[PDB]
Amino acid sequence: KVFGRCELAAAMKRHGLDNYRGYSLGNWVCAAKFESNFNTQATNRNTDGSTDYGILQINSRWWCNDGRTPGSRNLCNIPCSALLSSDITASVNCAKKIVSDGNGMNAWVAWRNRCKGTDVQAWIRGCRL
């Protein structure tokens, strides 16, 4: 599913990401924009043989099992395919674990490079939330 911006904002909010670990909703929307362009089906292979999955491009070395990433830890206890659903529940639950891991949203290099330090509230402008 390709979410609209406000559509995704409302879903993320509903699932409790607004202000989760102190990151306001615009941070999560901005991260999704630059990781996946709001597309739940996005996948991208990495050089180490892992793959990133879903709206928040969560990685198969640590977080989810894709059956092809040796020394996978599956810390979210999910198949990576669950992160591709139109239902963002699995992505949100796993994102909550990731952002709790110590480096906050710096875990998402696209957030660090295109969101951190910017006016992230812009990403929820115009939305009825």
UniProtKB/Swiss-Prot annotation:
**What top-tier enzyme class does this entry carry?**
hydrolase
- Transcription regulation: is it a keyword of this entry? no
Subcellular location, record wording: Secreted
Q: Name one GO molecular function term.
A: lysozyme activity
Q: Residue ranges of the C-type lysozyme domain?
A: 1-129
One Gene Ontology term of the biological-process aspect is: defense response to Gram-negative bacterium
Q: Which residues bind substrate?
A: 101
User: Catalytic center at which residues?
Assistant: 35, 52
Task: Name the principal localization, coarsely classed.
Answer: secreted
Is Cell cycle among this UniProt entry's keywords?
Answer: no
Q: What is this enzyme's EC?
A: 3.2.1.17
An example Pfam family from this entry, by short name, is Lys
The intrachain disulfides are 6-127, 30-115, 64-80, 76-94
What Gene Ontology cellular component terms go with this record? cytoplasm; endoplasmic reticulum; extracellular space
Keyword annotations for this protein, in alphabetical order, are: Allergen, Antimicrobial, Bacteriolytic enzyme, Disulfide bond, Glycosidase, Hydrolase, Secreted, Signal
Reactions mediated catalytically: Hydrolysis of (1->4)-beta-linkages between N-acetylmuramic acid and N-acetyl-D-glucosamine residues in a peptidoglycan and between N-acetyl-D-glucosamine residues in chitodextrins
Give a brief account of the tissues where this protein occurs: In the egg white and polymorphonuclear leukocytes.
Q: Which family does it belong to?
A: Belongs to the glycosyl hydrolase 22 family.
Q: What else is known?
A: Lysozyme C is capable of both hydrolysis and transglycosylation; it also shows a slight esterase activity. It acts rapidly on both peptide-substituted and unsubstituted peptidoglycan, and slowly on chitin oligosaccharides.
Describe, as the record does, how this protein assembles with itself and its partners: Monomer.
Summarize the protein's role.
Lysozymes have primarily a bacteriolytic function; those in tissues and body fluids are associated with the monocyte-macrophage system and enhance the activity of immunoagents. Has bacteriolytic activity against M.luteus.
Q: What is this protein called?
A: Lysozyme C
Instruction: Give the organism the record lists.
Output: Gallus gallus
Q: Which gene encodes it?
A: LYZ
